[PDB]
Amino acid sequence: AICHDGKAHFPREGVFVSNGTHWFVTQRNFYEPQIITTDNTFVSGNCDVVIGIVNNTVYDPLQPELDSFKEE
Amino acid sequence: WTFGAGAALQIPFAMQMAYRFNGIGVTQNVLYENQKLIANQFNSAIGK
Ligand SMILES: *[C@@H]1O[C@H](CO)[C@@H](O[C@@H]2O[C@H](CO)[C@@H](O[C@@H]3O[C@H](CO)[C@@H](O)[C@H](O[C@H]4O[C@H](CO)[C@@H](O)[C@H](O)[C@@H]4O[C@@H]4O[C@H](CO)[C@@H](O)[C@H](O)[C@H]4NC(C)=O)[C@@H]3O)[C@H](O)[C@H]2NC(C)=O)[C@H](O)[C@H]1NC(C)=O
Numbered sequence: 222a223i224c225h226d227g228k229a230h231f232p233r234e235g236v237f238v239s240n241g242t243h244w245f246v247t248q249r250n251f252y253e254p255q256i257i258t259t260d261n262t263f264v265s266g267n268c269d270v271v272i273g274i275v276n277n278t279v280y281d282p283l284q285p286e287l288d289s290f291k292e293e
Numbered sequence: 294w295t296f297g298a299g300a301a302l303q304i305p306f307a308m309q310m311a312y313r314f315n316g317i318g319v320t321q322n323v324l325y326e327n328q329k330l331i332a333n334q335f336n337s338a339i340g341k
């Protein structure tokens with residue numbers, strides 16, 4: 222899994238992998254990395270139960286639009 | 294099951310069980326939140 226803000230995010234379909242510095246989510250039968258965002262994972266529960274959870278961040282697609290929206 | 298289709302690929306057992314649960318139509322969070330209960334039930338079953 223993965224912890225961002227106290228909420229554990231799981232992959233909609235695929236697995237989390239890391240090349241050594243960054244984490245990605247990829248389909249199971251073929252290697253093609255994808256940046257992990259809110260469109261790949263769904264929240265459930267909190268960070269205090271899962272075993273082996275990791276501590277990387279998760280992107281949000283809507284943030285840049287707000288900045289432009291505030292700009293104009 | 295990858296070793297039945299081709300070369301053998303390693304995978305943690307918890308993740309494998311999550312795959313199976315997804316197979317029978319149950320989200321993964323159930324397994325990742327009840328791991329201990331499932332393990333105890335399995336051990337007791339083999340003992341019986
Ligand atoms: C991922 O990265 C984030 C960075 O912020 C970490 O955030 C953590 O969030 C926790 C709150 O949910 C903080 O505390 C957590 O919950 C309990 C209360 O603190 C406790 O079980 C842990 O906190 C202790 O361990 C942390 C791990 O380093 C310490 O940072 C933290 O200061 C606590 O250390 C002592 O704990 C005892 C008991 O609570 C206290 O009596 C002491 O006073 C504490 N010492 C000091 C100097 O304060 C648990 O983390 C947590 O503080 C906060 N930061 C960290 C590093 O944990 C996530 O933990 C991190 N997750 C993973 C898997 O890396």
Ligand SMILES: *[C@@H]1O[C@H](CO)[C@@H](O[C@@H]2O[C@H](CO)[C@@H](O[C@@H]3O[C@H](CO)[C@@H](O)[C@H](O)[C@@H]3O)[C@H](O)[C@H]2NC(C)=O)[C@H](O)[C@H]1NC(C)=O
Binds near residue numbers: 241243
């Ligand atoms: C593992 O994946 C990470 C992805 O974050 C790789 O990060 C890599 O970081 C370097 C440095 O930025 C990138 O190279 C280039 O750097 C120049 C610096 O100016 C920049 O202008 C380029 O746009 C580019 O960022 C590299 O692209 C980037 N790679 C990826 C896939 O994002 C990291 O290198 C990977 N490590 C291994 C061992 O695979």
Ligand SMILES: *[C@@H]1O[C@H](CO)[C@@H](O[C@@H]2O[C@H](CO)[C@@H](O)[C@H](O)[C@H]2NC(C)=O)[C@H](O)[C@H]1NC(C)=O
Binds near residue numbers: 272273
């Ligand atoms: C996954 O396996 C690794 C070992 O390869 C475990 O890491 C160590 O396990 C021993 C217990 O025998 C501990 O004494 C060490 O403190 C562990 N080292 C670290 C960095 O954790 C690891 O515990 C296993 N992962 C889980 C969730 O149990």
